[PDB]
Design an enzyme around this catalytic site. Structure first.
Site, PDB file in Angstrom:
ATOM      1  N   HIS A  62       0.826  -1.200   0.000  1.00  0.00           N
ATOM      2  CA  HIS A  62       0.000   0.000   0.000  1.00  0.00           C
ATOM      3  C   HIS A  62       0.867   1.259   0.000  1.00  0.00           C
ATOM      4  O   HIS A  62       0.449   2.317  -0.464  1.00  0.00           O
ATOM      5  CB  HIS A  62      -0.939  -0.004   1.205  1.00  0.00           C
ATOM      6  CG  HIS A  62      -1.815  -1.210   1.288  1.00  0.00           C
ATOM      7  ND1 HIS A  62      -1.673  -2.170   2.266  1.00  0.00           N
ATOM      8  CD2 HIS A  62      -2.823  -1.632   0.493  1.00  0.00           C
ATOM      9  CE1 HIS A  62      -2.555  -3.129   2.068  1.00  0.00           C
ATOM     10  NE2 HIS A  62      -3.265  -2.827   0.996  1.00  0.00           N
ATOM     11  N   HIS A  92       5.552   6.761   6.719  1.00  0.00           N
ATOM     12  CA  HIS A  92       5.316   6.331   5.350  1.00  0.00           C
ATOM     13  C   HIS A  92       4.789   7.535   4.585  1.00  0.00           C
ATOM     14  O   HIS A  92       4.525   8.588   5.179  1.00  0.00           O
ATOM     15  CB  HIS A  92       4.271   5.212   5.314  1.00  0.00           C
ATOM     16  CG  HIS A  92       2.952   5.598   5.877  1.00  0.00           C
ATOM     17  ND1 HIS A  92       2.653   5.494   7.222  1.00  0.00           N
ATOM     18  CD2 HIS A  92       1.868   6.168   5.302  1.00  0.00           C
ATOM     19  CE1 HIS A  92       1.444   5.976   7.447  1.00  0.00           C
ATOM     20  NE2 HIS A  92       0.948   6.387   6.302  1.00  0.00           N
ATOM     21  N   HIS A  94       2.297   9.045   1.027  1.00  0.00           N
ATOM     22  CA  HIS A  94       1.162   8.879   0.123  1.00  0.00           C
ATOM     23  C   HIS A  94       1.566   9.817  -1.010  1.00  0.00           C
ATOM     24  O   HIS A  94       2.012  10.930  -0.757  1.00  0.00           O
ATOM     25  CB  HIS A  94      -0.137   9.373   0.755  1.00  0.00           C
ATOM     26  CG  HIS A  94      -0.573   8.565   1.934  1.00  0.00           C
ATOM     27  ND1 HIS A  94      -1.337   7.426   1.820  1.00  0.00           N
ATOM     28  CD2 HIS A  94      -0.317   8.717   3.254  1.00  0.00           C
ATOM     29  CE1 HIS A  94      -1.534   6.914   3.022  1.00  0.00           C
ATOM     30  NE2 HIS A  94      -0.926   7.685   3.906  1.00  0.00           N
ATOM     31  N   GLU A 104      -3.153  13.589   1.121  1.00  0.00           N
ATOM     32  CA  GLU A 104      -4.446  13.155   1.607  1.00  0.00           C
ATOM     33  C   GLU A 104      -5.188  14.381   2.115  1.00  0.00           C
ATOM     34  O   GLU A 104      -6.316  14.640   1.714  1.00  0.00           O
ATOM     35  CB  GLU A 104      -4.268  12.096   2.692  1.00  0.00           C
ATOM     36  CG  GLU A 104      -3.564  10.863   2.155  1.00  0.00           C
ATOM     37  CD  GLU A 104      -3.912   9.598   2.904  1.00  0.00           C
ATOM     38  OE1 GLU A 104      -3.619   9.526   4.120  1.00  0.00           O
ATOM     39  OE2 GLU A 104      -4.477   8.677   2.284  1.00  0.00           O
ATOM     40  N   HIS A 117       3.583  10.835   6.741  1.00  0.00           N
ATOM     41  CA  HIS A 117       2.902  10.554   7.995  1.00  0.00           C
ATOM     42  C   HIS A 117       3.837   9.885   8.976  1.00  0.00           C
ATOM     43  O   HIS A 117       4.333   8.789   8.724  1.00  0.00           O
ATOM     44  CB  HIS A 117       1.696   9.649   7.773  1.00  0.00           C
ATOM     45  CG  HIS A 117       0.558  10.306   7.058  1.00  0.00           C
ATOM     46  ND1 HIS A 117      -0.462   9.605   6.471  1.00  0.00           N
ATOM     47  CD2 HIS A 117       0.277  11.612   6.850  1.00  0.00           C
ATOM     48  CE1 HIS A 117      -1.320  10.436   5.930  1.00  0.00           C
ATOM     49  NE2 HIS A 117      -0.898  11.667   6.142  1.00  0.00           N
ATOM     50  N   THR A 196      -6.060   6.638   7.855  1.00  0.00           N
ATOM     51  CA  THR A 196      -6.593   6.863   6.517  1.00  0.00           C
ATOM     52  C   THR A 196      -6.638   5.610   5.650  1.00  0.00           C
ATOM     53  O   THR A 196      -6.983   5.664   4.470  1.00  0.00           O
ATOM     54  CB  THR A 196      -5.816   7.983   5.775  1.00  0.00           C
ATOM     55  OG1 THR A 196      -4.447   7.581   5.599  1.00  0.00           O
ATOM     56  CG2 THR A 196      -5.865   9.280   6.578  1.00  0.00           C
TER      57      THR A 196
HETATM   58 ZN   LIG Z   1      -0.707   7.569   5.955  1.00  0.00          ZN
END
Ligand SMILES: [Zn+2]
Length: 258
Positions: A62, A92, A94, A104, A117, A196
């Site tokens: 992911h 990590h 996004h 996000e 994050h 999230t």
């Molecule tokens: Zn995250």
């Protein structure tokens, strides 16, 4: 089937397996800077990462995560809107398929190229697994990434991505100092939210930094070379692994600055 970010298993489908997806304190959200409430009661953030001990970097299918030793108070977050000590467990990102999307959270509808994050858990619960079941169990520091000048402190992460291209791959990643990923100012917005990604538990106190950090086009491009798939399977580029903004509902976003 299993949740993801594709057309048939993306965010819009998550509620079927995780009903809380339509909950009262879901994340991310759009931060309306003119509706945010300045709170003079908010204390400055206290980030103590000098003793941080990174251990490994993993592609979990992911995103990729850099894990830290959280068996002691080595790297902790205190102050701000928090009550107690929160230990850093992993961080990590996004990101998007294009520089115009990837974050996000959004600021006045503006999307950034990516979002970092840093996940911390409340030590009074003893347990990361126990912490996620509490309304004040986690504290996540969110940092926006904009494309521009390269970020020196991020290169070590970028160079090892080739070794964890597919899902399930991990590599030793020691001696990494997360302080090299922080912006100059620690001014922030804060609100009660959730993870999230599934299980989407509403156990997070979000602390989103106002100042974005800049990374180069080449650095972000390397993020886009990762795969959602495992080795031997059809290649699916790991891009657009972000959840869209959710309804703010009965929540107030507070700002540490005016
Ligand atoms: Zn995250």
């Amino acid at each position: 089937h299993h949740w993801g970010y594709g057309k048939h298993n993306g965010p819009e489908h998550w509620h079927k397996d995780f009903p809380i997806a339509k909950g009262e304190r879901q994340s991310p959200v759009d931060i309306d800077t003119h509706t945010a409430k300045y709170d003079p009661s908010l204390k400055p953030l206290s980030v103590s990462y000098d003793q941080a001990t990174s251990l490994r970097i993993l592609n979990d299918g992911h995103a990729f995560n850099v894990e830290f030793d959280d068996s002691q108070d080595k790297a902790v977050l205190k102050g701000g809107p928090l009550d107690g000590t929160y230990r850093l467990i992993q961080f990590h990102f996004h990101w998007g398929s294009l520089d115009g999307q990837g974050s996000e959270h959004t600021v006045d509808k503006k999307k950034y190229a990516a979002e970092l994050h840093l996940v911390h858990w409340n030590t009074k619960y003893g347990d990361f697994g126990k912490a996620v079941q509490q309304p004040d169990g986690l504290a996540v520091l969110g940092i926006f990434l904009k494309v521009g000048s390269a970020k020196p402190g991020l290169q070590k992460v970028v160079d090892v991505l080739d070794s964890i291209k597919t899902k399930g791959k991990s590599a030793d990643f020691t001696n990494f100092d997360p302080r090299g990923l922080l912006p100059e100012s620690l001014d922030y917005w804060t609100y009660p939210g959730s993870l999230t990604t599934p299980p989407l538990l509403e156990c997070v106190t979000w602390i989103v930094l106002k100042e974005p950090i800049s990374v180069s086009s080449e650095q972000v491009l390397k993020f886009r070379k990762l795969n959602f798939n495992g080795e031997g399977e059809p290649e699916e580029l790991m891009v657009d692994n972000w959840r869209p903004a959710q309804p703010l509902k009965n929540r107030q976003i507070k700002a540490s600055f005016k």
